[PDB]
RNA sequence: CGCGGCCCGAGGCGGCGGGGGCGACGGGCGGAACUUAAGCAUAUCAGUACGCCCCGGAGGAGAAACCAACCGGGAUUCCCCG
RNA sequence: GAAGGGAGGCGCGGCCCUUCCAAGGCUAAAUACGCCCCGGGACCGAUAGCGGACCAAGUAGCGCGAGCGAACGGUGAAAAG
């Protein structure tokens, strides 16, 4: 029941004990680099829930990202077209901060396979996430039927093609039925299928 | 066919007709120019078959 | 110029060795109609850019 | 060169790591690939299930 | 509408009809090593001063759902009226 | 495309002789009020029908029956209809052991199309 | 000295002027030949099995 | 003031991986204006051109926190129909 | 900022019914498609057809550069020229 106790404990983020621990952790992370290897997961139970195992080939990295909205990249803050495309500073990114951390780590470590990620802290100008990564050429990984599927060549750079959980949510794939019929198997594919001009032999 | 070159019209005021020209001054693009495209090029979306009850 | 690198000198060397006509025994061995080599150049007319 | 290559190849006949000039000729993509038995591996529970219900031959009518 | 008119609907067939203590123990233990969140203490104070509609407004503003808010108020009322 | 699809069908049928290409699938009613009184082919038999014929999902899948544990029956008439369908199919199905000589296997006929329309 | 090559879709003529197939393509030719009519597939099958 | 354990780090050695290329098809982002409205600013062109990143022989999607309202169906994909 | 929860193409509050179980993961088939190879055509026939039918074409030539970019088919049965 130990992990049940841990889970119920982690549902109370505003208690004095967890508040103190969070303050200590956020101070500690603020003195380090933006990408860093961890010796072991900071949250064992959440890592287990997301698929982590304690064997050779599983690694954990901590990633930091900045908070807030986005500003367009145009010289002197001038858009030139029609008045409806004139905004500069009030925009919001189309993908979540959790999905941006995986992209940063995947770019930094192109020889590993990304699996999942989870929240670990925030402080008012930053958020921290942890990413689970797999080494696809370690023999323990290659000879295990439970994780073998990630050694296939189609699992290359999953985060670059929006295939992780956060990318899938940004694509609208957590929904089904009414409201989700124009976005599978992808938005562009559905648009292409709905606008094709079919010209049969016996029209 | 006929649209792989770079050709633009010179304006009036040089004593030549107003069709598009290549860098050396050769006429291009128009259907009455040597090397140009068809006025209405043939396409495969023409209806080739017919229906009979 | 008179103060060149060896790299430029080697590329100009190949241009000179290639400025030749078609040999007479080649023209008749291959039954050639066009007997001039149109990849020749003349110093007074060309821009080698090398 | 052929004689020298044959001698050297006989020198590394049974080692774990041999010079890269003697390894089997493949492409990059097929070199970096799972073998056939690694693809057929299953967890034990699925192995048990797939043995108690083997494929059978039958005809209808 | 939303339903086809039929004075003998479903008269041709006969229908078929379909259809934890450990959790409470675990919750009680965690309640001793940690307290209550700051916004629940405020609701407890309001319930102690006899201001029910104020408590409902506060909970609804905090949670954003009226059913969850009423459930929370009923849950917390014991720690206020038990004194 | 017509020729290619036919060739694929023929090859697959050759590879599994004498098993039929299709599986036995249930008889269901068409949904709305507009098609209320007619039947079509469904996805798979429910567990209640199999219990009616005393079979398991593993055995059913072994002898070429499609099983759909997602579907639930809504009346007893459907259950009766599909139990009768299963009984007919079981009456008409023959099994070959690994001890049968090759000749009598050659004598078997491979069924075409939908199993029982 | 950028690691990648300079290629732009707004000019398919320059892509046409310099690209794969405008040179000898020695290694690719050899591998394609060994695959379509040769023993590369047999070797791969033996190595994997 | 010395030395053992754990923890957090540093330098080197061995064996294995990565990087770049491919006018199509595929996935993810950033993202116009000409044009139509007989003017034009919301709208349209267009979730297009183009820029950047990433695989494969296909990719993506996929076994219901689904449709429905019926004498109901039953993972995904593709075709016909409106 | 949470504990039973989600949905039923008009919002809010109340009471029912019908259906399903998010915030973790894998999966063949039916489908798309250039280069390259093979087959066919009520297609063009040297100002046409690809820019490019010619032993040397993205060649000669032009531009600081990004780029731009042609013209040129035919003796005769036999060179018996
Ligand atoms: K021309
Ligand atoms: K649009
Ligand atoms: Mg998937
Ligand atoms: Mg033309
Ligand atoms: Mg090293
Ligand atoms: Mg236009
Ligand atoms: Mg206008
Ligand atoms: Mg006008
Ligand atoms: Mg105007
Ligand atoms: Mg639109
Ligand atoms: Mg896939
Ligand atoms: Mg309604
Ligand atoms: Mg597939
Ligand atoms: Mg021509
Ligand atoms: Na790359
Ligand atoms: Na490939
Ligand atoms: Na002529």
From TrEMBL, chain B:
<comment type="similarity">
    <text>Belongs to the universal ribosomal protein uL4 family.</text>
</comment>
<feature type="binding site">
    <location>
        <position position="19"/>
    </location>
    <ligand>
        <name>Mg(2+)</name>
    </ligand>
</feature>
<protein>
    <recommendedName>
        <fullName>Large ribosomal subunit protein uL4</fullName>
    </recommendedName>
</protein>
TrEMBL record, chain D:
<comment type="similarity">
    <text>Belongs to the universal ribosomal protein uL29 family.</text>
</comment>
<protein>
    <submittedName>
        <fullName>LSU ribosomal protein L29P/L35</fullName>
    </submittedName>
</protein>
Automatic annotation (TrEMBL), chain E:
<protein>
    <submittedName>
        <fullName>Ribosomal protein L36e</fullName>
    </submittedName>
</protein>
<keyword id="KW-0687">Ribonucleoprotein</keyword>
<dbReference type="InterPro" id="IPR000509">
    <property type="entry name" value="Ribosomal_eL36"/>
</dbReference>
<dbReference type="GO" id="GO:0002181">
    <property type="term" value="P:cytoplasmic translation"/>
</dbReference>
<keyword id="KW-0689">Ribosomal protein</keyword>
<dbReference type="GO" id="GO:0003735">
    <property type="term" value="F:structural constituent of ribosome"/>
</dbReference>
<dbReference type="GO" id="GO:0022625">
    <property type="term" value="C:cytosolic large ribosomal subunit"/>
</dbReference>
<dbReference type="InterPro" id="IPR038097">
    <property type="entry name" value="Ribosomal_eL36_sf"/>
</dbReference>
<comment type="similarity">
    <text>Belongs to the eukaryotic ribosomal protein eL36 family.</text>
</comment>
<dbReference type="Pfam" id="PF01158">
    <property type="entry name" value="Ribosomal_L36e"/>
</dbReference>
TrEMBL record, chain G:
<comment type="similarity">
    <text>Belongs to the eukaryotic ribosomal protein eL37 family.</text>
</comment>
<protein>
    <recommendedName>
        <fullName>Ribosomal protein L37</fullName>
    </recommendedName>
</protein>
<comment type="function">
    <text>Component of the large ribosomal subunit. The ribosome is a large ribonucleoprotein complex responsible for the synthesis of proteins in the cell.</text>
</comment>
């Amino acid at each position: 029941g130990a992990y049940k106790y841990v889970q119920e404990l982690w549902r109370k983020k505003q208690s004095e004990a967890l508040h103190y621990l969070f303050r200590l952790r956020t101070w500690e992370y603020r003195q380090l680099n933006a990408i860093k290897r961890c010796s072991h997961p900071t949250r064992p139970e959440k890592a287990r829930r997301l698929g982590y195992k304690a064997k050779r080939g599983y690694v954990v990295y901590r990633v930091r990202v900045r908070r807030g909205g986005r500003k367009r990249q145009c010289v002197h803050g001038i858009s030139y077209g029609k008045p409806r495309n004139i905004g500069i500073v009030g925009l919001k990114p189309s993908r979540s901060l959790r999905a941006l951390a995986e992209q940063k780590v995947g770019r930094r470590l192109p020889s590993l396979r990304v699996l999942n990620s989870y929240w670990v802290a925030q402080d008012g100008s930053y958020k921290w996430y942890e990413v689970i990564l797999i080494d696809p050429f370690h023999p323990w990984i290659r000879n295990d039927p439970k994780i073998n599927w990630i050694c296939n060549p189609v699992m290359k750079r999953r985060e670059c093609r929006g295939l992780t959980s956060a990318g899938r949510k940004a694509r609208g794939l957590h929904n089904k039925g009414i409201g989700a019929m124009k976005l599978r198997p992808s938005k562009r594919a559905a648009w292409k299928r709905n606008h094709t001009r079919s010209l049969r032999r016996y029209r | 066919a006929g649209v792989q070159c770079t050709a633009h019209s010179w304006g009036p005021g040089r004593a030549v007709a107003r069709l598009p020209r290549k860098h050396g001054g050769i006429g291009a693009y128009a259907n009455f120019a040597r090397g140009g495209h068809m006025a209405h090029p043939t396409t495969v979306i023409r209806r080739w078959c017919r229906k009979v009850n | 110029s008179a103060n060149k690198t060896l790299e430029r000198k080697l590329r100009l060397g190949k241009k000179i060795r290639m400025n030749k006509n078609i040999p007479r025994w080649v023209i008749l061995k291959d039954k050639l109609k066009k007997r001039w080599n149109y990849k020749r150049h003349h110093w007074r007319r060309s821009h080698l850019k090398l | 060169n052929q004689k020298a290559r044959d001698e050297a190849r006989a020198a590394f006949e049974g080692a774990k790591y041999i010079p890269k000039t003697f390894r089997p000729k493949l492409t990059h993509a097929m070199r970096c690939q799972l073998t056939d038995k690694q693809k057929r591996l299953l967890p034990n529970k699925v192995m048990k299930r797939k043995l108690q219900f083997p494929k059978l031959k039958y005809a209808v009518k | 509408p939303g339903k086809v008119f039929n004075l003998k609907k479903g008269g041709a067939v006969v229908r078929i009809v379909r259809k934890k203590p450990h959790q409470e123990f675990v919750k009680s233990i965690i309640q001793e090593c940690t307290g209550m969140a700051p916004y629940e203490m405020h609701i407890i104070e309001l319930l102690r001063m006899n201001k029910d509609r104020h408590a409902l407004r506060y909970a609804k503003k905090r949670l954003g759902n009226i059913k969850r808010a009423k459930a929370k108020r009923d849950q917390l009322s014991v720690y206020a009226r038990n004194i | 495309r017509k020729i290619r699809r036919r060739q694929t069908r023929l090859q697959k049928a050759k590879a599994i002789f004498p098993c039929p290409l299709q599986k036995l699938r249930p008889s269901v009613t068409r949904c709305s009020q507009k098609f209320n009184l007619t039947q079509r082919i469904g996805r798979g038999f429910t567990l209640r029908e199999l219990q009616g014929v005393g079979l398991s999902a593993g055995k059913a899948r072994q002898i070429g029956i499609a099983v759909d544990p997602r579907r639930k029956n809504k009346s007893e008439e459907s259950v009766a209809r599909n139990v009768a369908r299963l009984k007919e199919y079981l009456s008409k199905v023959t099994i070959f052991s690994k001890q049968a000589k090759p000749e009598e296997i050659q004598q078997a006929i491979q069924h075409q199309g939908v199993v029982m329309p | 000295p950028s690691a990648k090559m300079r290629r732009y879709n707004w000019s398919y003529k320059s892509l046409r002027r310099r690209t794969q197939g405008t040179g000898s393509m020695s290694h690719m030719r050899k591998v394609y030949r060994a695959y379509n009519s040769g023993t590369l597939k047999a070797n791969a099958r033996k190595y994997l099995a």
